[PDB]
Ligand binder design. Structure first.
Ligand SMILES: CN1c2c(nc(N)[nH]c2=O)NC[C@@H]1CNc1ccc(C(=O)N[C@@H](CCC(=O)O)C(=O)O)cc1
Ligand SMILES: CN1c2c(nc(N)[nH]c2=O)NC[C@@H]1CNc1ccc(C(=O)N[C@@H](CCC(=O)O)C(=O)O)cc1
Ligand SMILES: CN1c2c(nc(N)[nH]c2=O)NC[C@@H]1CNc1ccc(C(=O)N[C@@H](CCC(=O)O)C(=O)O)cc1
Ligand SMILES: CN1c2c(nc(N)[nH]c2=O)NC[C@@H]1CNc1ccc(C(=O)N[C@@H](CCC(=O)O)C(=O)O)cc1
Lengths: 286, 285
């Protein structure tokens, strides 16, 4: 389902996204956390499950978390790799094809390293041409030099067949990126790959500082409301939905294949329950 | 008539008929008679467009022929230009758009007053809405296997379709199509319509002209001709067979394919064979 959507460059891809727990936790806490992820996510209708990688918070390896903890979830997993964490020989090994299974992955370069991103892309070309590779796109970064479309075209050239954005909190940056992506592709006679927009609810100052650490900002107006002790969680979701709806419209008009990834980044029941509900609402919309 | 939409929609099924304007030396009444015969036969065709060749013998200018003798034919005209015969300034003048009217042109380089690369830049500057096509030569693919790259590069410079020279070798054409398809698939490119030219050959006179244009027929075919056999039908039959094979290959891979039936002969029998073939190809596609 997911593999085909991606190979045929279709709209409508929908994924949910989680970060594995800390390594620190007892072996029993993990299985509980893990069984909770399984119960709620198995209740969705998604094409795949993104599992993030971070580069004090050291989380379970995304692929190990996938295989050894989440096998009961019968959907593909998109395994993120902060390649700079891996020596080039670890990276060759992790990228090897395994007989009788597909593989989905997003290679993430340095936010600011034992292995550079250009090198990781060629290591993949060497060892597993069939790995369904995605790239990270950052619409906010397009405001600074109007070349994030060019950055993702260079990633397409390097093997990428889809892009998953960080959390989108600004519709104009996102439409500006989509625009320059559409027009450049058209002018250079290119086909387009799926642009998967991530939505990430934010319901506490705790969630927010994790988000800032990931490089995600929310609007100053919204943060202001949080620092002045209002509940922003529902305004998160409403603003996120608003944004995605406008992007889905912009994308229909121009035939840009668009997907959505609903990211759950909080340790709080209420916020996690908001993510799950957002993931259901998004399916309904598209 | 649907021609622009088929081009812009990258559709299969473009069919055109192809003529070279008569010699410049014939008289205004004789050009009018030649032109009346053309309009008579070609108006009996269901085609998308009439290709009008430019030679780099001296023949009436194709745009001038189209506009002042072929008004009666209600179909778009694809104006060939051997850019090398025109100065950079005269080319600007001819490229300029005409109000409420689509322009179609194939720019041909040298086998010169203007380089082809500069002719493309002139189109970019003076008329971006000119529906521009390129010559593709499958036979030449067998030299270095890079004709597909030649055309990709022409697409980059503004071409939106390709009209090959007369096809007589199905394997070279299929090799060119194959590499075009696969290179397009792997570098994320859309494909543009490849219009294959079929050109009946009925006499040594037709052949010497075709040879001068850079076209060859198969040795076995030319052998029968030089041994005084009528090859007109054989050349048509072969042309049809090649195109059926190319259509099948193209349909399987989703490659947009068209056909241009070229008449290149002064002999009535060869001209009627070309008309017939045009109607045959339409039926086939
Ligand atoms: C998307 N990220 C992310 C996550 N985990 C969660 N939960 N959420 C996230 O958004 N883990 C990986 C990354 C963490 N943050 C970031 C943010 C930006 C870049 C970044 O600028 N990436 C460029 C690299 C530039 C380079 O060195 O070439 C890239 O294209 O990958 C990397 C990591
Ligand atoms: C490393 N992670 C992490 C983070 N954010 C913070 N602040 N801390 C973290 O350790 N973001 C990503 C990931 C999330 N980790 C976890 C760990 C446990 C539970 C968990 O115990 N879930 C219960 C708790 C309900 C509640 O506390 O309200 C559940 O019901 O789902 C959730 C996410
Ligand atoms: C297609 N041609 C043609 C015609 N007229 C008729 N009737 N039939 C034809 O096939 N007029 C123009 C051209 C004459 N023959 C030729 C054959 C090859 C090239 C050629 O190789 N063209 C390259 C140019 C490369 C360069 O400029 O170096 C091209 O891309 O156009 C040009 C003219
Ligand atoms: C410059 N041209 C030309 C050539 N080939 C040769 N050898 N000489 C040429 O001058 N090929 C292309 C173009 C064709 N010119 C012409 C000129 C006149 C008629 C013509 O009078 N057609 C009549 C004659 C029929 C007959 O001779 O039996 C007709 O019935 O259509 C056709 C093509």
């Amino acid at each position: 389902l997911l593999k085909q959507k991606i190979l045929n460059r279709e709209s409508g891809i929908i994924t949910y996204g989680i970060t594995p727990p800390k390594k620190n936790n007892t072996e029993e806490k993990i299985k509980e956390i893990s069984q909770k992820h399984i119960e709620r996510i198995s209740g969705l209708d998604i094409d795949g499950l993104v599992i993030y990688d971070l580069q004090f918070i050291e989380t379970i390896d995304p692929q190990i978390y996938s295989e050894n903890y989440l096998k009961d979830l019968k959907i593909p997993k998109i395994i993120y790799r902060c390649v700079g964490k891996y020596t080039p020989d670890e990276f060759r090994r992790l990228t090897r094809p395994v007989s009788g299974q597909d593989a989905f992955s997003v290679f993430v370069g340095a936010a600011s390293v034992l292995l550079k991103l250009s090198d990781a892309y060629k290591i993949r070309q060497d060892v597993n041409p069939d790995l369904l590779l995605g790239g990270v796109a950052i619409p906010e970064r397009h405001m600074k030099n109007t070349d994030e479309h060019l950055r993702i075209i260079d990633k397409i050239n390097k093997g990428c067949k889809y892009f998953i954005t960080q959390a989108v909190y600004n519709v104009e940056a996102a439409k500006d990126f989509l625009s320059d992506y559409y027009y450049y592709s058209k002018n250079n006679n290119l086909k387009m790959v799926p642009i998967i927009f991530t939505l990430t609810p934010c319901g506490s100052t705790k969630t927010l500082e994790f988000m800032k650490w990931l490089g995600i900002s929310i609007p100053r107006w919204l943060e202001n409301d949080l620092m002045n002790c209002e509940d922003i969680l529902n305004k998160s979701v409403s603003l996120s939905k608003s944004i995605f709806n406008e992007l889905m419209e912009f994308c229909l008009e121009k035939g840009i294949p668009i997907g959505c990834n609903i990211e759950s980044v909080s340790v709080r029941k209420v916020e996690i329950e908001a993510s799950i509900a957002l993931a259901k609402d998004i399916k309904y919309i598209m």
